[PDB]
Structures are given as structure tokens and as C-alpha cells.
Amino acid sequence: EWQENKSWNAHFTEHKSQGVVVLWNENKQQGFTNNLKRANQAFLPASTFKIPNSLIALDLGVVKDEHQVFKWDGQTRDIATWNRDHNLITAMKYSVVPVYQEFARQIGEARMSKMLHAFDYGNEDISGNVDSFWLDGGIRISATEQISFLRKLYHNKLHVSERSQRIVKQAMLTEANGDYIIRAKTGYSTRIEPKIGWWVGWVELDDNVWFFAMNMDMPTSDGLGLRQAITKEVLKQEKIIP
Numbered sequence: 035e036w037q038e039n040k041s042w043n044a045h046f047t048e049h050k051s052q053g054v055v056v057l058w059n060e061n062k063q064q065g066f067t068n069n070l071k072r073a074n075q076a077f078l079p080a081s082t083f084k085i086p087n088s089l090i091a092l093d094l095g096v097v098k099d100e101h102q103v104f105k106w107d108g109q110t111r112d113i114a115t116w117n118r119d120h121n122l123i124t125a126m127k128y129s130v131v132p133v134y135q136e137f138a139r140q141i142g143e144a145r146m147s148k149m150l151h152a153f154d155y156g157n158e159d160i161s162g163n164v165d166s167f168w169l170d171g172g173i174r175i176s177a178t179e180q181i182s183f184l185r186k187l188y189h190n191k192l193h194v195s196e197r198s199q200r201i202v203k204q205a206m207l208t209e210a211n212g213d214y215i216i217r218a219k220t221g222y223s224t225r226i227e228p229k230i231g232w233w234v235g236w237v238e239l240d241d242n243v244w245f246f247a248m249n250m251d252m253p254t255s256d257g258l259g260l261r262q263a264i265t266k267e268v269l270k271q272e273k274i275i276p
């Protein structure tokens with residue numbers, strides 16, 4: 035049910051890069067990765083944590099729906115797309131940390147820990163600051179654990195309302211055409227070593243879904259586009275996307 039494919043390493047090496055890609059064929063119920071050890075090593079989730087954070091805020095009513103506007107606080111931050119009003123859709127798309135920090139403060143440590151325990155999310159550990167533990171606290175999750183979480187989400191099995199899960203899957207929409215739909219969430223972990231980039235989600239086909247979770251070493255922000263690029267090359271090699 036798990037199978038290693040060292041050939042994908044060619045795509046990391048081609049870009050002077052290091053990391054892991056994990057795929058899960060939902061229909062056949064089996065998985066593939068270029069590095070079984072790394073696939074199960076636990077990293078900070080960073081902004082991939084916006085998937086559970088969104089689910090929790092929605093189910094608790096911290097966020098009423100995907101249209102509720104979170105007004106820019108007027109602080110001019112380093113990322114231009116952060117210096118504006120957001121809803122849940124745009125906050126997810128632009129990884130607007132300060133919006134989700136407000137969610138986390140509203141959720142609170144007790145509810146947050148209870149929820150992550152209910153989700154079986156990673157090591158279920160929120161130690162650190164209530165509004166940054168997923169970037170520099172004690173929470174950790176592996177690429178394999180990301181897929182297990184993402185499969186519950188896809189099937190509406192997580193303990194939150196089906197409504198919450200449908201809203202978050204809508205907000206995860208990243209790309210779609212006649213050939214496929216990608217629902218995914220990037221992450222960029224820079225506060226604690228090793229600096230890594232993440233991309234987790236799934237590719238929806240006509241008659242199957244391919245879940246994926248990748249992380250890679252990311253010493254500089256200049257290589258952030260490699261998250262999607264290397265993932266897509268793997269997908270093409272496997273004839274999942276054209």
C-alpha cells in the first residue's frame with residue numbers, strides 16, 4: 035500500500051533542491067513517495083495550518099462564512115497583498131497570517147487544542163503562542179499525516195460540520211480547467227530551522243482523486259515557485275495531469 039519511487043528525485047535535483055512528494059491514489063488506496071523517511075518526518079505546518087484553522091473558526095462561529103470581511107488594521111506590512119481587506123477565500127489565497135492570528139486568538143488555547151485532538155492533526159501539540167504556534171510553536175505534522183487529514187476533509191469525516199468542510203474545500207480552490215481541479219494550500223516555514231516550503235492538497239480528476247503533500251528545503255524565498263513546479267512535474271511523470 036506504500037511504494038517508494040526514487041525517480042522523482044530527478045525533479046528535485048534538476049532544481050538544486052531537496053524534499054519529498056507524497057501521492058495517494060484514492061481509488062486504488064495506495065501511496066507513492068520519493069523518500070519514505072522524510073514523508074513521515076514531522077515539520078512545522080506553517081501556513082498549511084490555515085486548513086484546520088479555517089475549519090475551526092467556521093465551526094465555532096468565529097468566522098460566519100466565506101464572505102465575512104476582515105478589515106485591514108492599517109499596519110503596512112511587508113507583503114503588499116496583506117495590506118487590504120480580506121475574506122476567508124482571499125486570506126487563504128494570500129496566506130494572510132495576521133487574519134488567521136486573529137482567528138486563533140478568538141478560538142483560544144482550550145478550544146484549539148480540543149479541536150486538533152478531535153482532528154488527529156499531527157502531534158496535536160499547540161505549545162507556544164496561541165496565535166503563532168503553527169509557525170514557531172510545538173505543533174508538527176508529516177506529509178503522510180497531511181494526507182490522512184486531507185482525506186477526512188475530502189470525505190466530510192472531520193468532527194466539524196459538513197458545512198465548515200465544504201467552505202474550506204471551496205477556499206482551497208487553486209486551479210481548474212477541463213483536465214483537473216487542484217484544491218491545495220501552500221506553506222512557507224521560516225521561523226524555525228529547517229526553512230521549508232509546503233504544498234498540500236489534492237488533484238480532482240473525472241473518476242479519481244490524487245491527494246498530495248510535498249515539502250522541500252527553502253533557504254530563500256526566491257525558490258517558492260518550485261513547490262508547484264516540482265509537484266506538477268511529478269504529476270506529469272505519473273500521467274495524472276497532461
Ligand SMILES: CNC(=O)COc1cc(C(=O)O)cc(-c2ccc(C(=O)O)c(OCc3ccccc3)c2)c1
Nearest residue numbers: 081112113115128129131169220221222225255258
Ligand atoms: C507575493 N506574496 C503573496 O501574495 C502572499 O504572501 C505570502 C505568501 C507565502 C507563500 O507561501 O507563498 C507565504 C507568506 C508568509 C507566511 C508566513 C509568514 C510568517 O509570519 O512566518 C510570513 O511572514 C512574512 C514574510 C515576508 C517576507 C518573507 C518571508 C516572510 C509570510 C506570505
